Design a protein around this ligand. Sequence first.
Ligand SMILES: O=C1NCc2c(-c3ccc(F)cc3F)cc(N3CCNCC3)cc2N1c1c(Cl)cccc1Cl
Length: 348
Amino acid sequence: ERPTFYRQELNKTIWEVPERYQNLSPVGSGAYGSVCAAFDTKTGLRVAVKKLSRPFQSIIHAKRTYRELRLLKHMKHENVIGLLDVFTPARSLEEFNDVYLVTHLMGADLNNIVKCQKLTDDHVQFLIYQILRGLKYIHSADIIHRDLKPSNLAVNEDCELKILDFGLARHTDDEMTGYVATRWYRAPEIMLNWMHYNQTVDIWSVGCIMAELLTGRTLFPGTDHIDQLKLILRLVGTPGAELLKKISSESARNYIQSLTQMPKMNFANVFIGANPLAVDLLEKMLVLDSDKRITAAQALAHAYFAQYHDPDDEPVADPYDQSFESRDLLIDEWKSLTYDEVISFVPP
Ligand SMILES: O=C1NCc2c(-c3ccc(F)cc3F)cc(N3CCNCC3)cc2N1c1c(Cl)cccc1Cl
């Protein structure tokens, strides 16, 4: 009793989808795949349909696709990108080679919103609240986003926020080189591989975002990895003895000690006019030592968010088994595991 599919050429590739999806209009492409906007006649919703390109071309790719689908199926939260539907036009595992993921249509990311709009302290309050609320949910399931940026944050007419880009292929060395927004929001420990990063890498990204919404300027627009580290240490001060020991990369630890020591700056003189409560939260977020960095849960209980905070409406996730991350399998096995996931999908 599987739906009947109809084919059509879109984005140079042939799209085969269930009849419920009508008026497919391409709205972007890339190496990630191909995305289309469409009307879902079953729910009446406006949705975004993503078709993955050669999802099983290599073991690395087969695993990536499995990882993305697992993540997307686990996410059931208001501020996190959920999955509305997932399908393949294949009737058997042998035919299986195309995977389509359906989700809400948000329309724009944080870069758009900020551009043609002036964010008040209440605007910033509300937007960051939602990010934190979604990160509390992500982190409680031991999931790390690793790449929060304004472009991974979707916002709609009602300023409702959703976190995107999970299990997406890591950025190449050529992608994080130079004067690029793909590196300005990263935590230093992972920009320069000082140690094994933990979930607080995300909190650092949030602070960079919050400061940008508050000042309307990139907090650390480095022209390269070094220049960016310098801008970072200028604001939060050079590392202390404690942090240094934690840096595994002895060449890294050796480079830091070469820079002239510098004290943390006064955030009230950096963020002039800003709500003193925002400044306080920024100081507890932009801490060099990730061990002393504020957690998403703790941040939600911070006075700056009093107007929205509600401990009974900030849900955690169910357990997310990612033992598969250390599992060594062949393409066909990753693929077979991806197939089971597609066919066991249960609409929300
Ligand atoms: O509104 C949405 N909805 C979904 C959506 C997905 C997506 C994620 C998971 C999935 F299962 C299927 C998807 F389609 C992926 C991207 N990117 C495209 C590739 N790079 C990352 C964002 C953008 C969007 N946008 C979006 C759009 Cl259509 C325009 C502007 C801003 C946003 Cl946030």
